[PDB]
């Protein structure tokens, strides 16, 4: 196995070949391919001519677009007091004593790392446009380069292809001084452009001055957004943005592992603390800027694997991604709801019709897809079980409206997680090992987090697939034993163990059925037996079920009547809630509030549609819901869930965090 690395300059090619020589005997070898620009590299990689290249976030964006669709597999790590993470700070450095502020940039000369790059372009230009300093309303007001050439008197923007003015301050030969790999390119080139007097300001990163003139830091200052000027070491409190680290992108195929193994071993051997003559990263320090940031930035102290569920859009984040897109586009009162499965989509489509369109619908196969869609902005909201509200929270979404189950006029609030078993049996909370279990779904409060967290806490084990002989816990690996009792849709394809209403044993009611049809214990909520007895459920399996046919399993090992859940429950837990992106909270609460007035349990038009009712399947909202109560603005997911639940799920997630949780933890720095 050989990794074909794509370089975009002769110096990079030289370093790459140097690394090739140093790893010729390794299990995974290295090959070097030099191209004219990073874009030729993106194309080469997509075309299976090369395998990887490290890119600035602005280029990670380009590489992730169709038809390339490359993905970030490794991210640079930079030193941080708070803790080295995979992000850096874009700063605007000027020479001390020049007095002008961020508000006086019009008419000044500027130095940039390169066109389309985070710190050197996307951040500074996007910011000046946002503040209105650079007049640009969108694509129809002309190109961004034209608006920038009109703003700054002259600049050096490696890679600029429309405005000659943006190359005017660049150093070098007439035909190549404006190339993306020219003398004044990169964070270090842009800095020297400033140092040489060719720019009044250089848009670089927080380590730049230290990398090029540590002993002369005192001759520079940072331009803060509030108009102030501060010392270069104050970047944490005087920066224009915190942006995702440069990352190695590659095709979304099997070769990603070998690419990572090569890097992992390469950095173990020539990492930041290596005594070797060869440094994978830099090392940082004074030297010809043309020799800096080769292959990887000199400021990187390590590479970190990027969770597989990550794509370029998620990697960059909604705000930055949206900023880039806005500079490529021109020139609301409807909620884009996320429905999991065909059943939820049908109820949602119906809601769309009676809401006259105030609510729109998007379908996905799994709940986790809703979290991803909302993170990207493709969808606006979704109701999630507390367990998922946690994951959604780690992902940056917040709970804005929550379900209440007691009285509709009551909109604290909660429900109880219980263990249900057949009345006539010895099954108890202490002899559960080796038994058949039924779970609403993995990751959910009552069906998984509470029961399993309780077992993990007391036992210390994480191997849950072997604790129960077998059972059904939707969302588990298809061939796992916790999927053996699941039934799928009964159609084709089977869709067995899928975490949606398509799975016969999915949800609170689904797990009860599984108990009646195949299990020894069901992990549901306090009202589940109630909701499906007394003929309230006309399904063949439950049309004749009786409340007294079941019993609750208390933690002490004893058993009780299903109506004494308050004295025999695994835990009292936070209710399900509607999560959204913070900026959307305002609109979603308002639109959701007007909807409940028309279609709530006492809706003025409840005869047309009822938000809180479904065929015993908790579609979109729990069937138990009596009303939604507003979650105070600014409430974090931890505050909403309560410290008790938070502590439980926090610990349990150390066992086997899902792909999405790992992905969002990465985004959070973990
Ligand atoms: Al950068
Ligand atoms: Al629940």
UniProtKB/Swiss-Prot annotation:
Amino-acid positions noted as binding hydrogencarbonate 1 in the UniProt annotation, renumbered to this chain: 113, 117, 119-120
Ranges of residues in domain Transferrin-like: 3-329, 335-654
Post-translation changes: Different forms of hen transferrin are distinguished by their carbohydrate composition. Ovotransferrin and embryo serum transferrin but not adult serum transferrin, have bisecting N-acetylglucosamine. Transferrin secreted by embryo hepatocytes in primary culture is marked by the presence of (alpha1-6) fucosylation of the core N-acetylglucosamine. Serum transferrins also differ in the number of attached neuraminic acid residues. In both embryo forms, sialylation occurs on the Man (alpha 1-3)-linked antennae.
Residues listed as glycosylation sites in the UniProt record: 457
UniProt key word Iron: yes
SS bond list: 6-41, 16-32, 111-193, 156-170, 167-178, 224-238, 338-370, 348-361, 395-664, 411-627, 438-514, 462-655, 472-486, 483-497, 554-568
Pfam families linked to this entry: Transferrin
UniProt binding sites for hydrogencarbonate 2: 440, 444, 446-447
Main localization of the protein described in the UniProt heading: secreted
SUPFAM superfamilies according to UniProt: Periplasmic binding protein-like II
Gene Ontology biological-process entries: acute-phase response; antibacterial humoral response; antimicrobial humoral response; intracellular iron ion homeostasis; iron ion transmembrane transport; iron ion transport; response to lipopolysaccharide; response to xenobiotic stimulus
Domain of life according to the entry: Eukaryota
Entry-linked InterPro entries: Transferrin (IPR016357), Transferrin-like_dom (IPR001156), Transferrin_Fe_BS (IPR018195)
Single GO MF annotation: ferric iron binding
Subcellular location: Secreted
Listed PROSITE patterns: TRANSFERRIN_LIKE_1 (PS00205), TRANSFERRIN_LIKE_2 (PS00206), TRANSFERRIN_LIKE_3 (PS00207), TRANSFERRIN_LIKE_4 (PS51408)
Expression sites (tissue/organ): Expressed in the magnum of the oviduct (at protein level).
Induction: Up-regulated by dietary stress. Increased expression at day 14 in the magnum of the oviduct in the corticosterone-fed laying hens (at protein level).
One cellular-component annotation, GO: organomineral extracellular matrix
Name of this protein: Ovotransferrin
């Amino acid at each position: 196995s050989v990794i074909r690395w794509c370089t975009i300059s002769s110096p990079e090619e030289k370093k790459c070949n140097n690394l090739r020589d140093l790893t010729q005997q390794e299990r995974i070898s290295l090959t070097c391919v030099q191209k004219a620009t990073y874009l030729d590299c993106i194309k080469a990689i997509a075309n299976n001519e090369a395998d990887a290249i490290s890119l600035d976030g602005g280029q990670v964006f380009e590489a992730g677009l169709a038809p390339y669709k490359l993905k970030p597999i490794a991210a640079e790590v930079y030193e941080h007091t708070e803790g080295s993470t995979t992000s850096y700070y874009a700063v605007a450095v000027v020479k001390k004593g020049t007095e002008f502020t961020v508000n006086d940039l019009q008419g000044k000369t500027s130095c940039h790392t390169g066109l389309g790059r985070s710190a050197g372009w996307n951040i500074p230009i996007g910011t000046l446009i946002h503040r209105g300093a650079i007049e640009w309303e969108g694509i129809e007001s002309g190109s961004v380069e034209q608006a920038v050439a009109k703003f700054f008197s002259a600049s050096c923007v490696p890679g600029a292809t429309i405005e000659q003015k943006l190359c005017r301050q660049c150093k070098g030969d007439p035909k190549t001084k404006c190339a993306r790999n020219a003398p004044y390119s990169g964070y270090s080139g842009a800095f020297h452009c400033l140092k040489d007097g060719k720019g009044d300001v250089a848009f670089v990163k927080h380590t730049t001055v230290n990398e090029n003139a540590p002993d002369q830091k005192d001759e520079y200052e940072l331009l803060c957004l509030d108009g102030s000027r501060q010392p270069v070491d104050n970047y944490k409190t005087c920066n224009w943005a915190r942006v995702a680290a440069h990352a190695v992108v590659a095709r979304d195929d099997n070769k990603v592992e070998d690419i990572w193994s090569f890097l992992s071993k390469a950095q173990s051997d020539f990492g930041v603390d290596t005594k070797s003559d060869f440094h994978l990263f830099g090392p940082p320090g004074k030297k010809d800027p043309v020799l800096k940031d080769l292959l990887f930035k000199d400021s990187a102290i390590m590479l970190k694997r990027v969770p597989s569920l990550m794509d370029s859009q998620l990697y960059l984040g909604f705000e930055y991604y949206s900023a880039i897109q806005s500079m490529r586009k021109d020139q609301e009162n409807r909620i884009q709801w996320c429905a999991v499965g065909k059943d939820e989509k049908s109820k949602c489509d119906r809601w769309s019709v009676v809401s006259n369109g105030d609510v729109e619908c998007t379908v996905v196969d799994e709940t986790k897809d809703c979290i991803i869609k909302i993170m990207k902005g493709e969808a606006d909201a979704v109701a999630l079980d507390g367990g998922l509200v946690y994951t959604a929270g780690v992902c940056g979404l917040v709970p804005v409206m929550a379900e209440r189950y007691d009285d509709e006029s009551q909109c604290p609030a909660s429900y109880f997680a219980v263990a249900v078993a057949r009345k006539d049996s010895n099954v108890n909370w202490n002899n559960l090992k080796g038994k058949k279990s039924c779970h609403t779904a993995v990751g959910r409060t009552a069906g998984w987090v509470i029961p399993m967290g309780l077992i993990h806490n007391r036992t210390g084990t994480c191997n849950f697939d072997e604790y129960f002989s077998e059972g059904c816990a939707p969302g588990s690996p298809p061939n796992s034993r916790l999927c053996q009792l699941c039934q799928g849709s009964g159609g084709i394809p089977p869709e067995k163990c899928v975490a949606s209403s398509h799975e016969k044993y999915f949800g609170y009611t689904g797990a009860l059925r599984c108990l009646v049809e195949k299990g020894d214990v069901a992990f549901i909520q306090h009202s589940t037996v109630e909701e499906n007895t007394g003929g309230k459920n006309k399904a063949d399996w439950a049309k004749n079920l009786q409340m007294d046919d079941f019993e609750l399993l208390c933690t002490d090992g004893r058993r009780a009547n299903v109506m004494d859940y308050r004295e025999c429950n695994l835990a009292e837990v936070p209710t399900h809630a509607v999560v959204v992106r913070p900026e959307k909270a305002n609109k979603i609460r308002d639109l959701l509030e007007r909807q409940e007035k028309r279609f709530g349990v006492n809706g003025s038009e409840k005869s047309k549609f009822m938000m809180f009712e479904s065929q015993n399947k908790d579609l979109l909202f729990k069937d138990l819901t009596k009303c939604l109560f507003k979650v105070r603005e600014g409430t974090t997911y931890k505050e909403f869930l309560g410290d008790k639940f938070y502590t439980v799920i926090s610990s349990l997630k150390t066992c086997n965090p899902s792909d999405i949780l790992q992905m969002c933890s990465f985004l959070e720095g973990k």
